[PDB]
Enzyme design. Structure first.
Site, PDB file in Angstrom:
ATOM      1  N   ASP A  18      45.798  10.180   3.560  1.00 43.02           N
ATOM      2  CA  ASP A  18      47.250  10.303   3.604  1.00 43.02           C
ATOM      3  C   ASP A  18      47.766  11.631   4.102  1.00 43.02           C
ATOM      4  O   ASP A  18      48.955  11.934   3.954  1.00 43.02           O
ATOM      5  CB  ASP A  18      47.829  10.032   2.218  1.00 43.02           C
ATOM      6  CG  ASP A  18      47.939   8.552   1.936  1.00 43.02           C
ATOM      7  OD1 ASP A  18      47.721   7.773   2.872  1.00 43.02           O
ATOM      8  OD2 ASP A  18      48.266   8.167   0.809  1.00 43.02           O
ATOM      9  N   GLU A 114      44.670   4.952   0.416  1.00 40.51           N
ATOM     10  CA  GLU A 114      44.831   3.759   1.267  1.00 40.51           C
ATOM     11  C   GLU A 114      44.534   2.438   0.568  1.00 40.51           C
ATOM     12  O   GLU A 114      44.588   1.390   1.201  1.00 40.51           O
ATOM     13  CB  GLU A 114      43.902   3.838   2.494  1.00 40.51           C
ATOM     14  CG  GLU A 114      43.709   5.227   3.104  1.00 40.51           C
ATOM     15  CD  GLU A 114      44.742   5.556   4.155  1.00 40.51           C
ATOM     16  OE1 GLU A 114      45.952   5.474   3.857  1.00 40.51           O
ATOM     17  OE2 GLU A 114      44.345   5.905   5.283  1.00 40.51           O
TER      18      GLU A 114
HETATM   19 MN   LIG Z   1      49.076   6.165   0.307  1.00 38.06          MN
HETATM   20 MN   LIG Z   2      45.373   6.851   6.668  1.00 33.21          MN
HETATM   21 MN   LIG Z   3      48.055   5.863   4.050  1.00 36.87          MN
END
Ligand SMILES: [Mn+2]
Ligand SMILES: [Mn+2]
Ligand SMILES: [Mn+2]
Length: 192
Positions: A18, A114
DNA sequence: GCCTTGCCGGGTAA
DNA sequence: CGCGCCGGAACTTAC
DNA sequence: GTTCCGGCGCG
DNA sequence: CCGGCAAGGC
């Protein structure tokens, strides 16, 4: 600091998922090196992520501060540090050599970033197939079976699906492991 | 007939 | 002068 | 998630 | 990332 290698791998999971590692060039000829994790929730960043990063910063004697920057759609945790940048980038290159504890930390961090967070299905999305295939072997070696297929044709995004038949194994042994920081939800489940 | 998992479109959280 | 930390946020898209 | 901006610090 | 739909397996 079996423990900062663990915290490190956890943070690398969030970064890869992220955030990112950025080497910047400016006028002139100025530069900057950033370690970034973005996230919608401000308290998640300030309460669960930032303190781990701060611990790491202190252990490495990094003199950079942790910045929290507000964006329209997300908060950004940012460390501006050449040293920390290369610390994570080299770790990333040596990722296939992670020992078992690092693998679990990393998978845990990557899942927070994720993963399917309803935990009704156990899934991780990414455009980096090679990265998912590394996680696939680590899971198999851990007795957690899984498959990989292209889940989004529009964007080239693959999915790694963890077989619900090893659900209890995954959630209890990887996500809930006390050899390194517990992610939220997992920590909440333990305390009920 | 109950699960599991591939497929896929919506749009938020990166 | 040549690089490397701040602080912000406009910008694109991968989950 | 990514890369621009103006700013400051330091040898 | 989420969540619905359906082919496939038991
Ligand atoms: Mn996330
Ligand atoms: Mn990613
Ligand atoms: Mn992500």
């Amino acid at each position: 600091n079996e423990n900062v290698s663990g915290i490190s791998a956890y943070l690398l999971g969030l970064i890869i998922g992220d955030g990112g590692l950025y080497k910047l060039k400016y006028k002139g000829n100025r530069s900057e090196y950033r370690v970034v994790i973005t996230q919608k929730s401000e308290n998640l960043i300030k309460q669960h992520i930032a303190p781990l990063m701060q611990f790491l910063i202190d252990e490495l004697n990094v003199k950079s501060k942790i910045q929290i920057v507000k964006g329209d759609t997300r908060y950004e945790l940012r460390v501006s540090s050449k040293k920390l940048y290369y610390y994570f980038a080299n770790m990333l290159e040596r990722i296939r050599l992670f020992n078992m504890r690092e693998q679990i930390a990393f998978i845990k961090g990557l899942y927070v970033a994720e993963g399917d967070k309803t935990l009704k299905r156990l899934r991780i999305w990414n455009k980096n197939k090679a990265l998912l295939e590394i996680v696939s072997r680590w899971l198999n070696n851990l007795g957690v079976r899984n498959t990989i297929h292209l889940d989004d044709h529009r964007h080239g995004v693959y999915v790694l699906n963890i077989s619900l038949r090893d659900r209890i194994k995954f959630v209890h042994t990887i996500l809930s492991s006390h050899l390194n920081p517990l992610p939220p939800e997992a920590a909440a489940l333990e305390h009920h």
